Amino acid sequence: ELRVGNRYRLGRKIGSGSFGDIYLGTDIAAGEEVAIKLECVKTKHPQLHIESKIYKMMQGGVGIPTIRWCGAEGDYNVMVMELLGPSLEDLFNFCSRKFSLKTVLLLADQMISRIEYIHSKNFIHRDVKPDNFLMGLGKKGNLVYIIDFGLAKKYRDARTHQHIPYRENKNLTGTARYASINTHLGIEQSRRDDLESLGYVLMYFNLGSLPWQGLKAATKRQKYERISEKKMSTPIEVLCKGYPSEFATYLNFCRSLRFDDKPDYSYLRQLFRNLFHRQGFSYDYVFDWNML
Ligand SMILES: Nc1nccc(-c2c(-c3ccc(F)cc3)ncn2C2CCN(Cc3ccon3)CC2)n1
């Protein structure tokens, strides 16, 4: 009975709910399933209107969801996107918090491509985490999508491509678990940083958890300090021990990139492609969740 934008029937909450609650929806016209993000019109720091423009700039790219509608419904700012499947965090949990090397490699390939595509559209994501990557539905079931441009920001001019300046004393924009070491140091995020976080995501998939996860502290501030310290005292070689050398090569390459350097995305994809080949995995999309 409730119809957002006089078109999308509101269904079950999938939520929830910091910066916005997410609801299931159905288009009255097409019959297509949608996802509806709701944001309170009274919040201290608005984001939904800014995020919608970013999404529009990204339109037409592979693994970029299409924004169907923007509106205002009661005391809420409303955004409508095509419905996507479970996130990599949902699937990770569903697979008992361990992925096989084949799955990690299949995911790594598309994830590097999504980050590269955002970078081609003059933005850095700044919140690269498994929760922000979603599988498509039906025939797009094997496609990895990137979402959430809430912390995204321009790294270069749209017209000239002049990179933003180097700056320190920056606040932690994003999740502490996947933040780059340079982000912990208060350094201005750039392209390298999105890929460094990606490397921690892949290692998290490999290990089941990172060495800086589950650290017990007395305050939020004390916990970030513990993560920051743990992450800096953990060398790439210790973190990646017992895993193929490619994960260390990927991480060291990311940390060795200069602030304004254009990353060699092709090389990074090829590292994992070559490993995939050497491992003798079959060239299909039979992920771990398809074997349970
Ligand atoms: N399904 C779907 N399909 C499309 C988008 C979304 C969605 C949106 C969203 C953004 C703009 C918009 F216009 C409509 C919706 N924001 C977050 N999500 C999902 C992120 C992943 N969690 C699950 C989880 C929790 C921890 O780790 N994974 C489920 C909501 N959701």
Q: Residue 210: name the closest of 190, 236, 182, 185 by CA.
A: 236
Binding-site residue set for ATP = 14-22, 37
| Residue where the block lists tokens 């290990």 | 207
Pocket of ligand 1 (CB under 6 A): 14, 22, 35-37, 65, 79-81, 83-84, 87, 89-90, 131, 134, 147
Catalytic residue among 127, 148, 193, 288: 127
Mention every residue, 6+ apart, whose C-beta is less than 8 A from residue 118: 58, 124, 125, 146, 152, 194
What is the fold, at CATH topology level, of the domain defined by 85-291?
A: Transferase(Phosphotransferase); domain 1 (1.10.510)
User: What spacing in Å lies between the alpha carbon of 180 and ligand 1's midpoint?
Assistant: 24
For 63, list phi and psi in degrees, rounded to 5: 75, 25
Burial of 203 per CB tally in 10 Å (0-12, 13-18, 19+): buried
Q: Residue 65: name the closest of 84, 78, 91 by CA.
A: 84
For atom 1 of ligand 1, which residue has the closest CA? Answer: 84
What resolution in angstroms does the PDB record give?
2.4
Q: Both tokens of residue 56?
A: 């529009």
Position in ligand 1 atom list of the atom nearest CA 130: 27
Beta bridge partners of 145: 134
Mapping DSSP onto H, E and C, the string for the chain reads CCEECCCEEEEEECCCCCCCEEEEEEECCCCCEEEEEEEECCCCCCCHHHHHHHHHHCCCCCCCCCEEEEEEECCEEEEEEECCCCEHHHHHHHCCCCCCHHHHHHHHHHHHHHHHHHHHCCEECCCCCHHHEEECCHHHCCCEEECCCCCCEECECCCCCCECCCCCCCCCCCCCCCCCHHHHCCCCCCHHHHHHHHHHHHHHHHHCCCCCCCCCCCCHHHHHHHHHHHHHCCCHHHHCCCCCCHHHHHHHHHHCCCCCCCCCHHHHHHHHHHHHHHHCCCCCCCCHHHCC
User: What spacing in Å lies between the alpha carbon of 22 and ligand 1's midpoint?
Assistant: 6
| Residue where the block lists tokens 């498994």 | 130
To 10 degrees, the CA torsion angle through 134, 184, 157, 110? -30
Q: Are 180 and 189 in contact (CB under 8 A)?
A: yes
Q: Are 260 and 187 in contact (CB under 8 A)?
A: no
Strand-strand pairing, 21-27 and 8-13: antiparallel
Contacts for 20-29 with beta carbons within 8 Å, 24 or more apart?
A: 20/48, 24/83, 25/80, 25/83, 27/68, 28/3
CA distance 146 to 133: 5
CA distance 219 to 14: 29
Q: Residue 33: name the closest of 57, 19, 18, 12 by CA.
A: 12
- Catalytic site residue 127? yes
Question: By what method was this entry solved?
Answer: X-ray
| Residue where the block lists tokens 């409303």 | 78
Position in ligand 1 atom list of the atom nearest CA 84: 3
**Range 11-24+35-84 classified under CATH 3.30.200.20:** yes
Q: Residue 223: name the closest of 283, 270, 172 by CA.
A: 172
User: What spacing in Å lies between the alpha carbon of 232 and ligand 1's midpoint?
Assistant: 31
- Range(s) of the chain covered by CATH 1.10.510.10: 85-291
- Range(s) of the chain covered by CATH 3.30.200.20: 11-24+35-84
CA distance 58 to 47: 17
Chain discontinuities in the chain, listed by preceding residue (C to N exceeding 2.5 Å): none
